[PDB]
């Protein structure tokens, strides 16, 4: 109804976000799905705390996967731990479909909606988790009566109201005919950060370590030889270069970047090896002694 | 039961975050009463990948460390569900939330071994231990010491490091609102690491000395390995030699300085005379 | 120095503000019709009802009331609440109209006529009355306290906070405080925002202790 259905800007925690990406990834092209545990506050704030997953299959998302038995079973575990969580919504991964909600995915979302009125539907892209950009969206179903009278901008009110375009093609077309997409925010905590930042005890000595002379010598030999080749270029280059604009000087002296800059780059690489070795050389001897 | 399929234990950032988050969820216990939970992860590999952890409600008293509650029933039922998630997820061992191990931990370990095929007790700490590892991994071993101690069941350390998975690693960057001044990829990062290194060494170094004192008086049982390793460190000592840097960095930099200055010298007369005519023009131009 | 007492109280000040605005006013029917045709009930509408009310502000005009009777009727949801609320921004000053026009919307007349409108009136009222508040505040406390649903309670708490602004006194704070303690779904954001409004420009030891202590405890977004 336009008079009580608003979109749910989802605050997704580290425990949920990581879980969903990993589960989809291993299964591929077998698709994984599940229920999401979280808490609901406001009339629009859902924090997704944690997730567990439903049965994978080789046809992926289906009606058969969704049974009340799995959910009911989980809830008994929730009591025993003394965790309170109600069900916020459900998730799935589509490697085998785009962000558009497949015909079986809508069926599955309708059942889940009967149980929790406020229900969210999430596409995960496990494939994209391999690369350094990850695109995932959360959505909420829109009612048929709502469209005619209300129109889809009614979900946008009293919340963040960002509406996503996940390129063109099937994904966008399917979005428009089916659901309203709403944004993702990340929940964070200071403690949560601190865990992530932590490295190793071993790195403490790693820097200290006295870099072998042998290895250093390899680097030193490598640096002087490139320098000699470039040195010539440098020598011809300085006869001209009465004008500013360094890129023009790069075409003239030949190649991308000035030969003065090439020589410095090499001097600097050697400098970095040298810095660890010499600092380390005195430092080590004195401290253990 | 076997504790075999481990030579290394890598632990995900997920594991730590799950324990602090789960503390609030259960009861808001907060290490008032230490918690043991299942440690989940991969199998059929030499290396142990601890993919995941979930809490089990375990309260151990602070009157007494021999009394605890450990909820067994949860473990069997959670077992069937793990396959729904993925078929690489099985119970590897258990986690202790710290601050430290006990003698009591041997007894907690015998119960958990029935479920697992490769039980290990990995202490994941609710507080991060320093800037180092917030995790230490240990394995139950039957050993004698030539301290005049017959057969004991104790925990000897196995090397711990932090690993990650392709899906998980990306997700971590997005979540992070830190930028990393401790990345350790380059010279800028590398100099920070050296300052910290010295501080790290000092923190570790103190412990070694107190351990030696305890054996001397304030009687503590000698772990023979530790003493054997200590003596090795002092014998390798030599004295330092050479290493230095050239005048070359400067030469290049000076080259850049000449070029601009020559361009400047021709431009100067032109630019400086013109300024007065443009200046006057500007003030009038501005008004409209 | 007798009229000097009046102006300081705020009675006079409202008279001034309303007169300047009403008389000089410019208000064009076309904006309202263009908008009316484009969007029937939408989020776009929500921004409009408040915004078009602002454009022609400080006037007593019937023109809005007649023309966007139809807007109020079309609306449901959060859009309806803004539309009622926005009547206060038009009638800025207008002392006599402020209390009467809003009265119907307030819980002492209609109340199960639509909860959205019912809260909206309380919120419109605080808006007109702000920073001339002295008489108004008692009436606003009684109303908020009485009705106490979900919707009306949020509009009440935000409304009371605006009228009372800068009193820095426990009486408005205590009523509001009690609303903050329930941790009810919608009211929580208004009650927290409200505490700061009333306290403004001065401090009280009890005020600061509540706001900081409850922030740490809760993990519900609206109170925080």
Automatic annotation (TrEMBL), chain A:
Signal sequence range: none
A GO biological-process term: double-strand break repair via homologous recombination
Protein's UniProt keywords contain Metal-binding: yes
PROSITE patterns recorded: MPN
Alphabetized PANTHER family for the sequence: EUKARYOTIC TRANSLATION INITIATION FACTOR 3 -RELATED
GO terms of molecular function: endopeptidase activator activity; metal ion binding; metal-dependent deubiquitinase activity; proteasome binding
UniProt entry keywords in alphabetical sequence: Hydrolase, Metal-binding, Metalloprotease, Protease, Proteasome, Zinc
InterPro entries linked to this entry: JAMM/MPN+_dom (IPR000555), JAMM_MPN+_peptidase_M67A (IPR050242), MPN (IPR037518), RPN11_C (IPR056263)
SMART domains named in the record: JAB_MPN
Domain MPN, first and last residues per copy: 10-145
SUPFAM superfamilies (UniProt xref): JAB1/MPN domain (SSF102712)
Identification of the protein by name: Proteasome (Prosome, macropain) 26S subunit, non-ATPase, 14
Source domain of life: Eukaryota
Organism: Rattus norvegicus
Record's GO cellular component terms: proteasome regulatory particle, lid subcomplex
Automatic annotation (TrEMBL), chain B:
CDD domains associated with the record: MPN_RPN7_8
A Gene Ontology cellular-component term: proteasome regulatory particle
Signal peptide: none
Keywords: Proteasome
Pfam families xrefs: JAB, MitMem_reg
Keyword set includes Ubl conjugation: no
UniProt domain MPN: residue ranges: 9-144
Molecular-function GO terms, alphabetical: metallopeptidase activity; protein homodimerization activity
PROSITE patterns: MPN
The keyword tRNA-binding appears for this protein: no
PANTHER family referenced in this protein's UniProt entry, alphabetically: 26S PROTEASOME NON-ATPASE REGULATORY SUBUNIT 7, EUKARYOTIC TRANSLATION INITIATION FACTOR 3 SUBUNIT F-RELATED
Family: Belongs to the peptidase M67A family.
This protein's name: Proteasome 26S subunit, non-ATPase 7
Gene giving rise to this polypeptide: Psmd7
């Amino acid at each position: 109804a336009p008079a009580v259905d608003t979109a749910e800007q989802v605050y997704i925690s580290s425990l949920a976000l990581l879980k969903m990406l990993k589960h989809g990834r291993a299964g591929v092209p077998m698709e994984v799905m599940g229920l999401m545990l979280g808490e609901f506050v406001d009339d629009y704030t859902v924090r997704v705390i944690d997730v567990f997953a439903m049965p994978q299959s080789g046809t992926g998302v289906s009606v058969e996967a969704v049974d009340p038995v799995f959910q009911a079973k989980m809830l008994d575990m929730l009591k025993q731990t003394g965790r309170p969580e109600m069900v916020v919504g459900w998730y799935h991964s589509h490697p085998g479909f785009g962000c558009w909600l497949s015909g079986v995915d809508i069926n599955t979302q309708q059942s889940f909606e009967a149980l929790s009125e406020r229900a969210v539907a999430v596409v995960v892209d496990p494939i994209q988790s391999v690369k350094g950009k990850v695109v995932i969206d959360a959505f909420r179903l829109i009612n048929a009566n709502m469209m005619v009278l209300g129109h889809e901008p009614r979900q946008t009110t009293s919340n963040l109201g960002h509406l996503n375009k996940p390129s063109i093609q099937a994904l966008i077309h399917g979005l428009n005919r089916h659901y309203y997409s709403i944004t993702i925010n990340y929940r964070k905590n200071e403690l949560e950060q601190k865990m992530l930042l932590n490295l190793h005890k071993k790195s403490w000595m790693e820097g200290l370590t006295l870099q072998d002379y042998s290895e250093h010598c390899k680097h030193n030999e490598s640096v002087v030889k490139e320098m000699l080749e470039l040195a010539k270029n440098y020598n011809k280059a300085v006869e001209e270069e009465d004008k500013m604009t360094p890129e023009q000087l790069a075409i003239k002296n030949v190649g991308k970047q000035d030969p003065k800059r090439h020589l410095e780059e090499h001097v600097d690489v050697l400098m970095t090896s040298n810095i660890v070795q010499c600092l380390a050389a005195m430092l080590d001897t004195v401290v253990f002694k | 039961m076997p504790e075999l399929a481990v030579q290394k234990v890598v632990v995900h950032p997920l594991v730590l975050l799950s324990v602090v988050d789960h503390f609030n969820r259960i009861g808001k216990v907060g290490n008032q009463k230490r918690v043991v939970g299942v440690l989940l992860g991969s199998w059929q590999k030499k290396v142990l990948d601890v993919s995941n952890s979930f809490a089990v409600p375990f309260d151990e008293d602070d009157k007494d460390d021999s009394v605890w509650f450990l909820d067994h029933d949860y473990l069997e039922n959670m077992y069937g569900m793990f396959k729904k998630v993925n078929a690489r997820e099985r119970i590897v061992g258990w986690y202790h939330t710290g601050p430290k191990l006990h003698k009591n931990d041997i007894a907690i370990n015998e119960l958990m071994k029935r479920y697992c095929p490769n039980s290990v007790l990995v202490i994941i700490d609710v507080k991060p231990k320093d800037l180092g590892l917030p995790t230490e991994a240990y394995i139950s071993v039957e050993e004698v010491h030539d301290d005049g101690t017959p057969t004991s069941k104790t925990f000897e350390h196995v090397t711990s490091e932090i690993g990650a998975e392709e899906a998980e690693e990306v997700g971590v960057e997005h979540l992070l609102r830190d930028i990393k001044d401790t990345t350790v990829g380059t010279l800028s990062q590398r100099i920070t690491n050296q300052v910290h290194g010295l501080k790290g060494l000092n923190s570790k170094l103190l412990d070694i000395r107190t351990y030696l004192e305890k054996v001397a008086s304030g009687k503590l049982p000698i772990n023979h390995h530790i003493i054997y390793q200590l003596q090795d460190v002092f014998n390798l000592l030599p004295d330092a030699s050479l290493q230095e840097f050239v005048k070359a960095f400067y030469l290049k930099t000076n080259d850049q300085m000449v070029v601009v200055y020559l361009a400047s010298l021709i431009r100067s007369v032109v630019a400086l005379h013109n300024l007065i005519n443009n200046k006057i023009a500007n003030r009038d131009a501005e008004k409209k | 120095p007798l009229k000097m007492i009046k102006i300081l109280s705020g009675e006079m000040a409202i008279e001034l503000h309303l007169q300047f605005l009403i008389r000089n006013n410019n208000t064009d029917l076309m904006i309202l019709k263009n908008t009316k045709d484009a969007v029937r009930n939408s989020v776009c509408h929500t921004a409009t009802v408040i915004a078009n009310s602002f454009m022609h502000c400080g006037t007593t005009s019937d023109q809005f009331l007649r023309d966007n009777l139809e807007w109020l009727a079309r609306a449901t949801n959060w859009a309806k609440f803004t539309a009622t609320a926005s009547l206060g921004v038009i009638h800025k000053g207008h002392e006599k109209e402020a209390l009467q026009l809003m009265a119907t919307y307030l819980p002492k007349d209609t109340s199960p006529g639509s909860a959205y409108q019912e809260g909206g009136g309380l919120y419109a009222l605080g808006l007109i009355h702000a920073n001339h508040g002295g008489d108004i505040i008692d009436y606003l406390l009684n109303q908020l306290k009485n009705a106490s649903n979900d919707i009306v309670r949020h509009g009440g708490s935000l409304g009371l906070g605006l009228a009372a602004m800068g009193t820095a006194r426990q009486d408005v704070y205590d009523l509001l405080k009690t609303n903050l303690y329930q941790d009810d779904a919608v009211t929580g954001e208004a009650a927290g925002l409200a505490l700061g409004l009333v306290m403004l420009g001065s401090k009280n030891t009890q005020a600061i202790e509540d706001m900081v202590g409850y922030a740490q405890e809760t993990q519900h977004e609206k109170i925080l």
